[PDB]
Amino acid sequence: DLPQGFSALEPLVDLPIGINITRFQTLLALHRSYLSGWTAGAA
Amino acid sequence: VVVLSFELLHAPATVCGPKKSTNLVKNKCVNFNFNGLTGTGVLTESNKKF
Numbered sequence: 333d334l335p336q337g338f339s340a341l342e343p344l345v346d347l348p349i350g351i352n353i354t355r356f357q358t359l360l361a362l363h364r365s366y367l368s369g370w371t372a373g374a375a
Numbered sequence: 376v377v378v379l380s381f382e383l384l385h386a387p388a389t390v391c392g393p394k395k396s397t398n399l400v401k402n403k404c405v406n407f408n409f410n411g412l413t414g415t416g417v418l419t420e421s422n423k424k425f
């Protein structure tokens with residue numbers, strides 16, 4: 333998943349937020365099971 | 376009555392007045408002000424791909 337060679341990373345969006353950030357977390361998507369209320373998944 | 380209150384904080388200013396487009400003149404030595412960059416030079420056509 334981490335391949336060789338070079339892949340230049342292009343810019344995406346610079347945002348003038350001006351806040352203090354020291355921690356971060358990832359958000360995932362979960363689908364309702366409708367049958368264990370959410371379908372099992374891995375990321 | 377409409378009361379306008381102006382405040383300045385350590386955060387960068389983002390409410391600002393209108394900016395004049397004016398016009399572009401080429402092939403002559405003219406003072407140029409491009410997005411805050413000032414100077415003096417002749418603006419010719421460019422074949423460089425940005």
Ligand SMILES: *[C@@H]1O[C@H](CO)[C@@H](O)[C@H](O)[C@H]1NC(C)=O
Nearest residue numbers: 350351352353354355356385
């Ligand atoms: C940002 O938050 C951290 C943790 O609360 C704190 O140590 C740091 O002083 C804060 N930054 C500023 C500029 O206050």
